[PDB]
């Protein structure tokens, strides 16, 4: 199907196939040297150069080496600089270049490569779709939105562009507008639309506007393998971990941490109140679009397992206390933070990103009425000096209808069934 040989390369097809057979047989090192000799002898052959790049690519996989992959990325580029490169080969080479640049985190490099692909193949819709993903991966949602708008103006029923356009609209809090794009896109069944992110946000968008069909999409996301259950919808998971909305201290095994929080709760409270009174700018407004209404801010001491040194200058005794518990200070998928919430606040039903953490709440200033938290089908209240523990990968929701402020201390711990190996290896969130 793919024509990769130009006029000259057809005349050396026997040497090219001999080298490629070595690669497909798994003799990566012999294949590299074979293609290297072909590149030496035929420096202008695009197929020889692509063979070298693919062998370097395979070798980087065998050796798990970023440096070898950086070589391959350069050789895929060399292919594109040679004369008389067939169009199928040019596209294959730069597509892989971009994909491998993304694998290494060279999102700026991938973007330049994707922009070149679109310039070279201005009628290939899938490449424009890939360019939009390049922008999403660097956080440039404004340019990503423009790309999918251009795609949909030409091919209005492209499902990949629909689900990605809907994702962007929802991230901008255009909730009602996002629903038909996410739904139509998923329903298209096009490649790339059967993705847990789109079921997740479609159901959540529907929940926010009061569309009772939301749980039909959660139900179908569950049946298609994206969600462990309809209630537990996190997407960065280790399968097999015990799944319960609410946990006791003894069930977690972290009984010493809980005792320390409960015995020393007043020093934790007083440092939080001192920050409220003398350094309130350390409390930052919630910024993940999780409120329907109201005021909610957090003062973070640890995130991704890293201590915030300036923040700890505002709660030095609390930071000193917590240092004895690596189950939380080293939880690279959680945080340690104060959270203040004021009356008139409603936090939308939502889910955290990962099932690899459990979340402890210590009550610090709790009005006697008006504050409550639901996780799954059970609602609870806080108590001053007491710890609640829940799995925030389950859907949960919060209300604050008191007549004064509510302050809690939030401490994330690794899920207790994670091994030390997993705790060291999982990527941070």
């Amino acid at each position: 199907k793919p024509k990769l040989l130009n006029k000259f390369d057809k005349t050396i097809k026997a040497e090219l196939d001999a080298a490629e057979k070595l690669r497909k047989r798994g003799k990566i090192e012999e294949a590299v040297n074979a293609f290297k000799e072909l590149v030496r002898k035929y420096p202008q052959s695009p197929r020889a150069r692509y063979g070298k790049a693919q062998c370097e690519d395979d070798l980087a996989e065998k050796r798990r080496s970023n440096e070898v992959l950086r070589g391959a990325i350069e050789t895929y580029q060399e292919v594109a600089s040679l004369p008389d490169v067939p169009a199928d080969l040019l596209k294959l080479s730069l597509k892989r270049r971009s994909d491998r640049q993304q694998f290494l985190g060279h999102m700026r490099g991938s973007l330049l490569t994707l922009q070149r692909l679109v310039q070279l193949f201005p009628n290939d819709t899938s490449l424009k779709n890939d360019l939009g993903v390049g922008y999403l991966l660097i956080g440039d949602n404004d340019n990503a939105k423009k790309v999918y708008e251009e795609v949909l103006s030409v091919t209005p029923n492209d499902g990949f562009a629909k689900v990605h356009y809907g994702f962007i609209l929802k991230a901008q809090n255009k909730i009602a507008e996002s629903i038909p794009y996410l739904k139509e896109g998923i329903e298209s069944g096009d490649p790339g639309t059967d993705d847990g992110r789109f079921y997740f946000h479609l159901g959540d968008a529907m929940q926010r506007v009061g569309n009772k069909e939301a749980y039909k999409w959660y139900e179908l996301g569950h049946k298609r393998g994206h969600f462990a259950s309809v209630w537990q919808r996190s997407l960065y998971n280790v399968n097999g971990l015990k799944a319960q909305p609410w946990w006791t201290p003894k069930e977690t095994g972290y009984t010493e941490l809980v005792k320390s929080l409960e015995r020393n709760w007043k020093l934790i409270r007083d440092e939080g109140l001192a920050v409220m009174d003398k350094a309130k700018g350390l409390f930052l407004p919630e910024d993940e679009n999780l409120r329907e209404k109201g005021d909610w801010s957090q003062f973070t001491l640890w995130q991704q397992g890293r201590r915030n040194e300036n923040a700890c200058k505002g709660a030095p005794k609390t930071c000193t206390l917590l240092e004895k518990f690596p189950e939380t200070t080293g939880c690279r998928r959680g945080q340690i933070k104060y959270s203040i919430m004021h009356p008139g606040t409603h936090v939308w039903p939502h889910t955290g990103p990962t099932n690899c953490r459990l979340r402890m709440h210590l009550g610090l200033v709790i009005p006697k009425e008006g504050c409550k938290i639901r996780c799954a089908n059970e609602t609870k209240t806080w108590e001053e000096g007491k710890v609640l523990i829940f799995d925030d990968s389950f859907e949960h929701e919060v209300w604050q209808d008191a007549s004064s402020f509510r302050l809690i201390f939030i401490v994330d711990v690794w899920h207790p069934e994670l091994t030390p190996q997993q705790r060291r290896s999982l990527p941070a969130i």
């Binding site: 991966l137 997407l235 993940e288 939502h350 955290g352 990103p353 941070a428």
Partner: peptide
Amino acid sequence: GKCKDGLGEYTCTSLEGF
């Protein structure tokens, strides 16, 4: 852009190669 309490980003983990 980090996923702290929710799942709002296109991707929540970093890409750092092998």
